[PDB]
């Protein structure tokens, strides 16, 4: 609740910080000791060196070493910074591993392109910190405890002033440190908004060439930056406010010396007291910059509490192959506004089931449900009269292939877009058979050499027709028990998909297959068919069995029949 205890708990999860820093902090302490001891000895030494040269050859060597050991402080600056580079790299490690094992039901709410900078830019603020953080704080805290003990009159008999220098200053940093905390949470919640704007803009540059967007999306960037980030000077204004305020209470201690305070002691008293400031200007800098870190990490804390959606809790059950039964499952994408209404159907093995619905139904959502992404409230999904959750959470995903309604590809270099299914044993003499079972090898070999070809970002390299045929090979290399085709009519011609339908029939005969498609002439011979509508389903059986029996549509097909009856009489 104190916003401080989790932060040291946060760096605690990066384990190996304790080892080398403990050595690294130690020699920086004695670095403060030798810098304490240096200016008093040389002024007596030179008087000592009036003798000069003799003491000098030997002491020249001595000083070189000594002065070489004055350069040993650089090794402390190195070794702190090395463990400084360790602690940031542990954050980026632990942030990234949590980031992909968390449920997909998070990412739909908040902006994948926003949270990505919270890996980078909400760590790099601790790199610049941890030099000024540690090294400045330790070098002062020994000097201030080194001051008042040698200011021995003022901590045993004149204590009533050295109990004013810290606590009255401590009241001053409290609104500053709180305001410093309310700023660093804002900028770091706006760097993420700023980078999130651009990654939702820059890959879509072909649309932003709409010739009126370029005068506008530039204007959104400037309104992104200058109204916020030059308005990030609000940090720097308060940052410079600390200057007078440390002194404005410190000189208040200085005027206090006449209210309570022989004369031979007063002159030495001023001499030691003015050695406090360059120490005191460091410790307050640390307490400022510390609260800068917290607001830059307070957002990063909450994304370490979301609940680890991939479990490997496989109880006794992964392997056998049984039919799939949906049992009154009703899904809500938002729990007060649901779109699926206790649908109940059975997916028998070895036979291609299909799903056909109009635009706006629950077609694709039932597929994302059948990857067990949500497993909603009312209803259970079972297989073999066994509930699908208790098998495992996502080792059951391994048995299934899946292609989306769109065709997604990462920064591919084509052969790696197909590869990571079996992920270790790709068997290069088999990918071409997965290409031949997808009509891919025909229009790949004329390109420069399948490996050597590189797709774009979202896969621009290849085009749109080649995109869909590439992604369908991903499911046909994983060799699944259960296929899941979402759009086999998406971006491909009738010449292609006839080879596709004639290919997977050799594959899938004891391996059941759920495929939805537009344009019902691709699922006419399916062994089952469904007609889903707005979260409800009103159909069963074969298409010929459904056309004569059911009287709901009776022209969904005839909407597509009359679009094809024109082609006969126009040709003959």
Ligand X SMILES: Nc1ncnc2c1ncn2[C@@H]1O[C@H](COP(=O)(O)OP(=O)(O)OP(=O)(O)O)[C@@H](O)[C@H]1O
Residues that bind ligand X (CB under 6 A): 108, 333, 339, 357, 359-365, 405, 456, 460-466, 491
Residue 50 binds which entry of its own copies, Mg ion, ligand X, none, with Cβ cut-offs from 5 to 8 Å by kind? Answer: its own copies
CB atoms within 10 A of CB 483: 22
Place of tokens 């679009």: 563
Choice between 3 and 562, CB closer to its own copies: 562
In degrees and rounded to multiples of 5, residue 280 shows phi and psi of: -70, -30
Residue 208 site contact among Mg ion, its own copies, ligand X, none (CB < 5 to 8 Å, cut-off depends on kind):
its own copies
Buried b (16+ CB within 10 A) or exposed e, 161-193: bbeebeeebeebbeebbeebbebbbbbbbbbbe
Bridging pattern class, strands 536-537 and 386-387: unpaired
Instruction: Identify the residue whose tokens are 């959104």.
Output: 220
Q: Which residue stretches of 371-454 are H helix? A: 431-436
Cβ proximity to ligand X: between 49 and 374 the closer is: 374
Determine, following the binding rule CB under 8 A, whether residue 23 of this chain makes contact with its own copies: no
Binders of its own copies in range 406-425 (CB under 8 A): 406, 408, 410-411, 420-423
Give whichever of 4 and 460 is closer to ligand X, judged by the CB atom: 460
445: three-class secondary structure by DSSP = coil
Which segments of 411-501 are extended strands (E)?
Answer: 483-485
Q: In this complex, which beta carbon is closest to its own copies, that of residue 170 or of residue 524? A: 524
Question: Taking CB within 5 to 8 Å according to partner kind, which of ligand X, its own copies, Mg ion, none is near residue 62?
Answer: none
266 is in the binding site of which of ligand X, its own copies, Mg ion, none (Cβ under 5 to 8 A by kind)? its own copies
Task: Give kind and range of the element (H or E) at residue 221.
Answer: helix 214-225
Query: Could you say whether residue 405 binds Mg ion (CB under 5 A)?
Result: yes
Structure-token pair, residue 343? 């649908």
What residues between 248 and 287 interact with its own copies by CB under 8 A? 248, 251, 254-255, 258, 263, 266-267, 270, 274
Least distance between Mg ion and beta carbon 465 (Å): 8
Nearest Cα to Cα of residue 448 among 465, 464, 429, 461: 461
**Partners of 536 in the β-ladder:** 533
Shorter beta-carbon distance to its own copies: residue 254 or 381: 254
> Any residues with CB less than 8 A from the CB of 217 and at least 6 apart, and which?
201, 208
Please, which residue, 468 or 513, has the CB nearer to its own copies? 468
The footprint of its own copies on this chain (CB under 8 A) covers a number of residues equal to: 170
Binding of its own copies by 469 (CB under 8 A): yes
Interface positions, 377-396, toward its own copies (CB under 8 A): 394-395
**What are the contacts of 505-510 at 24+ separation with CB within 8 A?**
506/437, 507/437, 507/476, 508/350, 508/352, 508/483, 509/350, 510/349, 510/350
Determine the interface stretch with Mg ion among 333-341, 398-406, 447-455, 541-549 (rule: CB under 5 A).
398-406
Tokens found for residue 381: 């999904």
Among 26, 170, 236, 278, binds its own copies (CB under 8 A): 236
Residue nearest ligand X, Cβ-based: 364
Smallest gap from residue 88 Cβ to its own copies (A): 8
Give the footprint of its own copies on residues 335-374 (CB under 8 A): 337, 358-360, 364-365, 368, 371, 373
**CA 276: distance to chain centroid?**
44
Residue 112 or 405: the one with the smaller Cβ distance to Mg ion is 405
**Residue 107 sits in the site that holds its own copies (CB under 8 A):** yes
Q: How far is the CB of 363 from ligand X (least distance, A)?
A: 3
Residue 532 tokens read as 């889903």
From the list Mg ion, ligand X, its own copies, none, which binds 410 (C-beta under 5 to 8 Å, kind-based)? its own copies
Q: Please report how close the Cβ of residue 496 comes to ligand X at its closest, in angstroms.
A: 8
User: CA 186, CA 188: separation in Å to the nearest integer?
Assistant: 5
Residue with Cβ nearer its own copies (5 or 267): 267
Site for Mg ion (CB under 5 A): how many residues? 3
Minimum Å gap between C-beta 71 and its own copies is 4
Q: Residues 16, 58, 214, 308: which binds its own copies (CB under 8 A)?
A: 214
* Assigned token pair, 164: 């004013």
Number of separate helices (H) and strands (E) present in the chain: 25, 9
Q: Give the nearest distance from C-beta 547 to its own copies in angstroms.
A: 5
- Among 73, 155, 364, 380, interactor with Mg ion by CB under 5 A: 364
CB 162 to its own copies: min, Å: 19
Which one of ligand X, its own copies, Mg ion, none is in contact with 449 (Cβ closer than 5 to 8 A by kind)?
none
Taking the C-alpha atoms of residue 57 and residue 319, their distance in angstroms, rounded to an integer, is 83
Q: How far apart are CA 310 and CA 393, in angstroms?
A: 6
Task: Count CA atoms closer than 13 A to 37's CA, side-chain side.
Answer: 8
C-alpha 260 chain-centroid distance = 59
Site mask for its own copies (CB under 8 A), range 478-497, x = bound? x--------x-xxxxxxxx-
**Rounded-to-integer distance, Cα 74 and Cα 68, Å:** 10
**C-beta of residue 397 within 8 angstroms of C-beta of residue 309:** no
- Distance of CA 507 to CAs 323, 367, 409, 437, Å? 18, 21, 24, 9
Of 357 and 480, nearer to ligand X (C-beta) is 357
**With CB cut-offs between 5 and 8 Å by kind, which of ligand X, Mg ion, its own copies, none does residue 339 bind?**
ligand X
Nearer to its own copies, 66 or 152 (CB): 66
Structure tokens at 402: 């899946």
- Report the residue number, 327 or 491, with the smaller CB distance to its own copies: 491
Closer residue to ligand X in complex, CB, 289/496:
496
Instruction: Please state, in angstroms and rounded to a whole number, the distance separating the CA atoms of residues 421 and 394.
Output: 14
CA distance 561 to 565: 6
Alpha helix (H) residue ranges in 508-565: 543-549, 558-561
Strands (E), 410-456: none
> Which one of Mg ion, its own copies, ligand X, none interacts with residue 99, CB within 5 to 8 A by kind?
its own copies
Q: How far is the CB of 335 from ligand X (least distance, A)?
A: 12
Residues 160-199 that bind its own copies (CB under 8 A): 191, 194-199
Q: Which of 519, 538, 549, 552 binds its own copies (CB under 8 A)?
A: 519
Q: Which residues bind Mg ion (CB under 5 A)?
A: 364, 405, 486
């Amino acid at each position: 609740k104190s916003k401080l205890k989790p932060f040291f708990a946060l760096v605690r999860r990066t384990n190996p910080s304790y080892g080398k820093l403990a050595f690294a902090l130690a020699l920086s302490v004695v670095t403060t000791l030798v810098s304490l001891l240096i200016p008093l000895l040389t002024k007596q030494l030179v008087d000592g060196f009036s003798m000069s040269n003799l003491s000098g050859t030997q002491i020249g060597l001595i000083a070189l070493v000594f002065f070489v050991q004055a350069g040993l402080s650089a090794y402390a600056t190195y070794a702190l910074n090395y463990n400084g580079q360790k602690i940031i790299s542990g954050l980026r490690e632990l942030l990234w591993k949590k980031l992909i094992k968390l449920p997909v039901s998070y990412f739909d709410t908040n902006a994948s392109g926003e949270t990505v900078s919270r890996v980078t830019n909400d760590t790099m603020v601790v790199k610049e910190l941890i030099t000024t953080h540690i090294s400045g704080f330790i070098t002062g805290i020994i000097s201030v405890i080194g001051s008042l003990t040698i200011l021995f009159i003022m901590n045993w008999k004149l204590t009533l002033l050295v109990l004013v220098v810290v606590p009255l200053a401590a009241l001053i940093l409290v609104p500053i440190g709180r305001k410093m905390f309310s700023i660093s949470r804002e900028t770091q919640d706006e760097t993420a908004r700023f980078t999130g704007l651009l990654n939702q803009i820059l890959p879509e540059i072909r649309l932003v060439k709409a010739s009126n967007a370029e005068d506008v999306e530039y204007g959104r960037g400037k309104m992104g930056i200058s109204s916020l980030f030059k308005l990030g000077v609000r940090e720097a204004k308060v940052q410079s406010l600390v200057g007078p305020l440390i002194s404005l209470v410190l000189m208040a201690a200085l005027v206090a010396v006449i209210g309570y305070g022989t004369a031979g002691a007063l002159v030495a008293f001023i001499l030691y007291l003015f050695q406090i400031i360059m120490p005191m200007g460091q410790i307050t800098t640390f307490f400022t910059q510390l609260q800068k870190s917290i607001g830059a990490t307070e957002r990063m804390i909450e994304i370490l509490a979301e609940e680890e959606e991939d479990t490997v809790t496989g109880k006794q059950i992964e392997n056998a192959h049984l039919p799939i039964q949906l049992d009154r499952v009703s899904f809500g994408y938002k729990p007060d506004q649901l779109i699926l209404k206790e649908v109940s159907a059975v997916i028998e093995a070895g036979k291609v089931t299909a799903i056909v619905g109009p635009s706006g139904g629950g077609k694709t959502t039932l597929f994302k449900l059948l990857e067990r992404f949500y497993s909603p409230t009312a209803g259970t999904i079972r297989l073999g009269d066994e509930p699908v959750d208790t098998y495992s959470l996502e080792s059951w995903r391994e048995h299934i292939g899946y292609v989306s309604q769109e065709s997604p590809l990462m920064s591919g270099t084509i052969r790696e877009n197909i590869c990571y299914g079996l992920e270790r044993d790709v068997t290069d003499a088999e990918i071409e058979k997965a290409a031949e079972m997808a009509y891919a090898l025909n229009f790949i070999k004329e390109l420069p050499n399948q490996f050597d070809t590189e797709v774009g970002e979202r896969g621009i390299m290849l085009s749109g027709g080649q995109r869909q045929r590439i992604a369908i090979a991903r499911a046909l290399l994983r060799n699944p028990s259960i296929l899941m085709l979402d759009a086999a009519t998406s971006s491909l011609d009738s010449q292609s998909e006839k080879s596709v339908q004639q290919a997977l029939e050799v594959l899938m005969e004891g391996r059941t297959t759920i495929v939805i498609a537009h344009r019902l002439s691709t699922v006419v011979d399916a062994d089952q068919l469904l007609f889903v509508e707005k979260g409800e389903i009103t159909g069963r059986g074969t298409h010929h069995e459904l056309m004569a029996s059911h009287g709901l549509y009776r022209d969904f097909a005839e909407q597509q029949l009359k679009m094809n009856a024109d082609l006969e009489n126009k040709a003959g």
